[PDB]
Design a protein around this motif. Structure first.
Motif, mmCIF file in Angstrom:
data_model
loop_
_atom_site.group_PDB
_atom_site.id
_atom_site.type_symbol
_atom_site.label_atom_id
_atom_site.label_comp_id
_atom_site.label_asym_id
_atom_site.label_seq_id
_atom_site.Cartn_x
_atom_site.Cartn_y
_atom_site.Cartn_z
ATOM 1 N N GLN A 1 -3.668 2.155 -1.335
ATOM 2 C CA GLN A 1 -2.362 1.597 -1.661
ATOM 3 C C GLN A 1 -1.318 2.704 -1.585
ATOM 4 O O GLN A 1 -1.175 3.495 -2.522
ATOM 5 C CB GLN A 1 -2.375 0.960 -3.049
ATOM 6 C CG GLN A 1 -3.095 -0.376 -3.118
ATOM 7 C CD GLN A 1 -2.429 -1.438 -2.271
ATOM 8 O OE1 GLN A 1 -1.232 -1.689 -2.400
ATOM 9 N NE2 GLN A 1 -3.204 -2.073 -1.400
ATOM 10 N N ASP B 1 -5.017 -4.934 1.584
ATOM 11 C CA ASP B 1 -4.799 -5.869 0.485
ATOM 12 C C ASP B 1 -5.585 -5.463 -0.757
ATOM 13 O O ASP B 1 -5.342 -5.987 -1.851
ATOM 14 C CB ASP B 1 -5.178 -7.285 0.919
ATOM 15 C CG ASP B 1 -6.516 -7.341 1.629
ATOM 16 O OD1 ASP B 1 -7.524 -6.888 1.049
ATOM 17 O OD2 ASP B 1 -6.560 -7.841 2.773
ATOM 18 N N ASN C 1 -0.769 -8.369 -4.428
ATOM 19 C CA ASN C 1 -2.207 -8.189 -4.333
ATOM 20 C C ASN C 1 -2.923 -8.961 -5.442
ATOM 21 O O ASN C 1 -2.319 -9.313 -6.459
ATOM 22 C CB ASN C 1 -2.553 -6.704 -4.396
ATOM 23 C CG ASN C 1 -2.141 -5.959 -3.141
ATOM 24 O OD1 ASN C 1 -2.287 -6.467 -2.029
ATOM 25 N ND2 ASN C 1 -1.639 -4.742 -3.312
ATOM 26 N N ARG D 1 -7.000 -3.539 6.239
ATOM 27 C CA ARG D 1 -6.104 -4.611 5.818
ATOM 28 C C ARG D 1 -5.063 -4.117 4.821
ATOM 29 O O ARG D 1 -3.874 -4.428 4.951
ATOM 30 C CB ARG D 1 -6.913 -5.762 5.224
ATOM 31 C CG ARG D 1 -7.846 -6.429 6.215
ATOM 32 C CD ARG D 1 -8.766 -7.418 5.526
ATOM 33 N NE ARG D 1 -9.792 -7.918 6.431
ATOM 34 C CZ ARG D 1 -10.807 -8.688 6.061
ATOM 35 N NH1 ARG D 1 -10.963 -9.067 4.804
ATOM 36 N NH2 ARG D 1 -11.686 -9.084 6.976
ATOM 37 N N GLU E 1 3.076 -12.397 -0.850
ATOM 38 C CA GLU E 1 2.236 -12.542 -2.028
ATOM 39 C C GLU E 1 1.726 -11.168 -2.459
ATOM 40 O O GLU E 1 1.184 -10.422 -1.632
ATOM 41 C CB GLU E 1 1.053 -13.463 -1.701
ATOM 42 C CG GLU E 1 0.097 -13.931 -2.830
ATOM 43 C CD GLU E 1 0.718 -14.128 -4.216
ATOM 44 O OE1 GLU E 1 1.956 -14.236 -4.351
ATOM 45 O OE2 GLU E 1 -0.054 -14.153 -5.199
#
Lengths: 70, 57
Positions: A51, A46, B36, A44, B34
């Motif tokens: 990152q 998130d 994290n 995902r 949005e």
């Protein structure tokens, strides 16, 4: 005499094994949970992990550009 | 009665009094995604250490 001067009671080993089993069970469940969390975060994106950097938006110059339409 | 402008006067940055409304979204931008969840908290020692194979720490 041998049992008194060389060996501890039966309960000692019983409860030590219980504690060891508890610790190892926690470690195993934590390993599965960590693997699943890694998979979800990589899929995902998130999450805090995986990152990958993007362009910083503070580099953009917001000023008139000698042409009205940028 | 026209007075010719001096040197450097026509390059000044002036102000205009207008009633035209200021465009709210001149770029026609969409809604930004949005960010994290930016989790915050207090650090605690690792549960049962590294948990890497046989190492106990």
């Amino acid at each position: 005499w041998i049992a008194r001067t060389f060996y501890d009671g039966p309960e000692k080993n019983y409860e030590k094994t219980m504690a060891i089993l508890q610790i190892e069970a926690e470690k195993a469940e934590l390993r599965l949970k960590e693997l699943e969390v890694r998979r979800l975060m990589r899929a995902r994106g998130d999450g805090p992990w995986y990152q990958y950097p993007t362009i910083d938006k503070a580099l953009i110059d917001h000023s008139p550009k000698t042409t009205p339409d940028n | 009665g026209w007075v010719r402008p001096d040197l450097g006067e026509l390059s000044k940055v002036t102000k205009v009094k207008t009633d035209r409304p200021l465009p709210e979204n001149p770029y026609h931008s969409r809604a930004r995604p949005e960010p994290n969840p930016e989790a915050e908290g207090d650090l605690k020692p690792a549960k049962h250490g590294s948990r890497l194979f046989f190492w106990t720490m």
